Amino acid sequence: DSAIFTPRPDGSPPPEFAERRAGAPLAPVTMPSGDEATLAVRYADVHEVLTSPDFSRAALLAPEAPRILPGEEFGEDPNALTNMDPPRHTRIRRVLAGIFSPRHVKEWHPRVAAMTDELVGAVATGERPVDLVETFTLPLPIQIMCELMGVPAADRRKFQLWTDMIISSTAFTAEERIGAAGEFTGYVSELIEGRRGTGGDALIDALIEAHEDGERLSEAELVHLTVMLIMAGYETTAGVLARGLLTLLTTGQYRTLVEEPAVIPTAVEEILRYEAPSDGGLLRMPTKDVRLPSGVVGEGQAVMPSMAAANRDPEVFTDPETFDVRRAKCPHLTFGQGAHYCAGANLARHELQVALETLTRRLPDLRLAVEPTEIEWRKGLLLRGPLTVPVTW
Numbered sequence: 001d002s003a004i005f006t007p008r009p010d011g012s013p014p015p016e017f018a019e020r021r022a023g024a025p026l027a028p029v030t031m032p033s034g035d036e037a038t039l040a041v042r043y044a045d046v047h048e049v050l051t052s053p054d055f056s057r058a059a060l061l062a063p064e065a066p067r068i069l070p071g072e073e074f075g076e077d078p079n080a081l082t083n084m085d086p087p088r089h090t091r092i093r094r095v096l097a098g099i100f101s102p103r104h105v106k107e108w109h110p111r112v113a114a115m116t117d118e119l120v121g122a123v124a125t126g127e128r129p130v131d132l133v134e135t136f137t138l139p140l141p142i143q144i145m146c147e148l149m150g151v152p153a154a155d156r157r158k159f160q161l162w163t164d165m166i167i168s169s170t171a172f173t174a175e176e177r178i179g180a181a182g183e184f185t186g187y188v189s190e191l192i193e194g195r196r197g198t199g200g201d202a203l204i205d206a207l208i209e210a211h212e213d214g215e216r217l218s219e220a221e222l223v224h225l226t227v228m229l230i231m232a233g234y235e236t237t238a239g240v241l242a243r244g245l246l247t248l249l250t251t252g253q254y255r256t257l258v259e260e261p262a263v264i265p266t267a268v269e270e271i272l273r274y275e276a277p278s279d280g281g282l283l284r285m286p287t288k289d290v291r292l293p294s295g296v297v298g299e300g301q302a303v304m305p306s307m308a309a310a311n312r313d314p315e316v317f318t319d320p321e322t323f324d325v326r327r328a329k330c331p332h333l334t335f336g337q338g339a340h341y342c343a344g345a346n347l348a349r350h351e352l353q354v355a356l357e358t359l360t361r362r363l364p365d366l367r368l369a370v371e372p373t374e375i376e377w378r379k380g381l382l383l384r385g386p387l388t389v390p391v392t393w
């Protein structure tokens, strides 16, 4: 297991979050690696940990630094954006801010709608019951990312299988995951070679142009970013989408969106808040003693921010354990905050919105085909979600 506390059979939070928010807001936690870190669970603390300039990400690559998981995985690549500090991080963050500008993401809206229509159309004209994960919530983000990256349809499954292997640290050995990452990268390098200089207007072309014309990305940064964007845009989105649809169906609030589609934008934010798929996040190393709202974290003592625990803090969210698609106030931290705020947040939010728009439009009578306790879940602190979501109509 890679769960933060006891592995859980559903999407409910571990009781230690509420216990800690009440009586131990900044206390050590033993991570799956066996190393310790300070677990921040209150929203005020997590928000400061994510936004303060007095924390480092690159310091966690040092040999004696705490690690979240046992082994030497791929979050140790010094060319990964999540492992960088300013000024290097600043340069690449500025490149990505232009590439993912609201104007540029809006230009990708039609492809997002086309892929969503295709997959919902296939469900609606097919047999029932169906597993909505295999037929929709899993394929949709990876197909979108593959389209935006100029990947042929025939290769989407390889990308899905490679990503699943690389992120499933407890399911495959390091040799297997290293091998998949080597294929992934190798494919992406050949993709760039066949794509560069041909005048496309996709995400992949904007990344290539940043390297070739701007000289604002190195070759290793370009290749690593392209792989990361695919992996992040696929798994995290797919997990939030499956968790959110399961919760909509179990609470009966799917019907709320069918009858009042104007609620879908607040529903997307509430799904992000309530089904935040990572109980824990990337560690932050204090580069000096940092005064947080609940206490001081010492220089050199790494902090785990829990965005999921922050997302249920009653100081910020009234009735935080209630799922309410009409919730007006929803400043969740599911996309993080500060320097490493999700670079794809606009695209991810739009995908979720269009998924719910299209499912409720085409399949208004959708309902669970099994009792929710028959569904198996992933357990790990970096990504939890249901394995299947059987539905019918």
Ligand code: HEM
Pocket: 081, 082, 083, 093, 228, 229, 230, 232, 233, 234, 236, 237, 240, 281, 282, 307, 333, 334, 335, 336, 337, 339, 340, 341, 342, 343, 344, 345, 347, 348
């Ligand atoms: C629902 C979907 C998603 C969620 C909940 C999510 C969440 C996050 C979070 C929490 C972070 C910051 C991690 C930290 O600071 O420790 C992050 C970073 C990032 N996300 Fe997203 N993500 C989602 C979708 C996407 C999509 C669609 C893309 C790209 C197409 C993307 C690209 C990135 C990248 C590149 C970073 C690193 C930014 C940096 O370190 O400067 N994500 N994401």
